[model samples]
Target: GSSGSSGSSQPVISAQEQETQIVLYGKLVEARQKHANKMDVPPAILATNKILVDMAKMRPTTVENVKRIDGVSEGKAAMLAPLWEVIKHFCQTNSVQTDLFSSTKPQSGPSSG
Candidate 1:
C-alpha cells in the first residue's frame, strides 16, 4: 500500500557550503604543489594514479620496489635517488608511507645484456 502523504524535500546546500568546498580543494592542490616542489620532482610525477598507488603500496621501500613502476628504468632510479630522499623525508614528516614514492637502485653487477 502506498502512503498518500509526501514529505517535503530538504533544500540544497547554501552558498557557504559551496565556498567551503572550493577552499578545501584549493588547499589540497596547494599542498600537492608544495610537496612536489620540496621533492624537486614535477607535480605530474607525484600526481595520484590509483593503480600505481595500489601496486606500490604492496612493496617495501627498497630499490626493487621502485623498478616495478612503469617508465622507471634502473639508471633513472639511480639518478633520482636524491629526489627520492627528499620525498621520503616529506612523507615521514607527514606520516605517509615513504615506500610509495621510493625509487629502485640500478643493478650493482655488470649488465649481462
Candidate 2:
C-alpha cells in the first residue's frame, strides 16, 4: 500500500537571458550635492559625494537602504538624512519600478490602427 507519489517533474531548464540596464541622472546628482554641500560644510561634502556612488549604484528607496550601504556611517547618515526623501520623491515622479517579478506579457496585437 505505497502509492502516494505527487507530481514529479524533471529538470526544466530554459535558456532565456533577459538583462536590462537603466540610466537615471540629474535629480539624484543634483539632490546629492544640494544636500551634500548643505549638511556639514567643506570637508564633509567630500565624502558625501563618495557615498553618492552607492546611491547611484543601488538607487536607494528608503532611509534603511541608505543606512545599509557599505560606505554609509552614523555621521554620514546625518549628512544624507534629508536626501532619502528626495530620492523617494524622484522615484515617484519617474514611476521607477525595480521589482524582478513583473514579467507579464504585453499586448501583442496592433489591429486597430
Candidate 3:
C-alpha cells in the first residue's frame, strides 16, 4: 500500500525554515558588500539579488560550482571566497545539498529587473 498523505499540496520547507534561509542570504549579501568595498566597486552588480538567491537555494560548495550559476561568470565568481565561506557554514548547519542544480531546473524570479 502507498504511504502518501491526503489532500494538501504544501512544499517540504516551513515558513520559519524559509525565514532562516533568508537570514543566510542576508549574510551572503553582507559579505558581497564588504568585498565590493575592498575592490572599490558597487555591490549592486558584484552579487546581485539574483545571484544571491541562486546561491542561497543551490548552496554551492566551491568557487567552481558557483560559476555555474546564471550570470556568475568565472572572473566574477573567482573573487568570491568570502561568499563561499558563508554558504559553506550555512549548508553545514542546515544540511543543505550543494549539488541541487543537477536535478533542479534553473530558478526563475518573477519580480523587477
Candidate 4:
C-alpha cells in the first residue's frame, strides 16, 4: 500500500530520540494531515499508524528521504517533496533530531500526557 532520496536512504533515531520526542511528533502529524487535507491529498500521503507506532520516529529532512519511507509511494512522494520542508523545518525547530533513518521509526504520531 506504500513507497525518497539517497536510495542509500538509511534510517538513522537515537535511543534518547525515541523517548524524548512525543510532543513534537504529535504536532508534526497534526500539521501534516492538516496540510494534506487542505490540499486534497490522502492521509497516507503523509504516513499511517498501521505503518508504525510512532510517527516521530520517522524523521525525514529532504524530499528524497521522504520517498524511501515505507508508506511513501511515488505519487505520495511528489506531494510530500514540496510539503516535507515545512514539517522538516518544524521538526528541526523543535529539535526533532535529524539523520534518524525514518523507515525504522514508528508511525503512531508521538504525544504527551
- Which candidate's TM-score is highest? 3
Model 2: residues >4 Å from true position, as ranges? 1-25, 43-46, 98-113
For residues 1-113, what per-residue lDDT tens digits would candidate 1 score against the true structure?
77687788967546544443343334434544676677787865744443133333332234455556566666555543443344444445655444434444555788565
Please give the lDDT score for candidate 3. 0.79
**RMSD of model 2 against the true structure:** 15.6
* Each prediction's RMSD to truth: 13.7, 15.6, 13.2, 13.0
For model 2, what is the C-alpha lDDT against the true structure?
Answer: 0.54
With a 3 Å backbone cut-off (N, CA, C), the pairs that clash in candidate 3 are: none
Candidate 1: 10-residue stretch with minimal lDDT: 51-60
Cα lDDT tens digits, model 3, 1-113, are 77876686858667655766677789899999999889888998677888888887777767777888887887778887788788888878877656566744456866886
Q: Could you tell me the C-alpha RMSD of candidate 3 in Å?
A: 13.2
Where is model 4 more than 4 Å wrong at Cα? 1-15, 41-46, 50-55, 81-83, 94-96, 102-113
lDDT of each: 0.47, 0.54, 0.79, 0.59
| Pairs that clash in candidate 1 | 63-104
Instruction: For each candidate, give its TM-score against the true structure.
Output: 0.33, 0.51, 0.69, 0.53
Sorting all predicted structures by lDDT, with the top scorer first, yields: 3, 4, 2, 1
Q: How many clashing residue pairs appear in each of the predictions shown?
A: 1, 0, 0, 17
- Tens-digit lDDT track of model 2 for 1-113: 68776797856323221111123434556666665566555534534556665565456665656666667875666556555565566556766543222233356886865
Give the winner by lDDT: 1 or 2.
Answer: 2
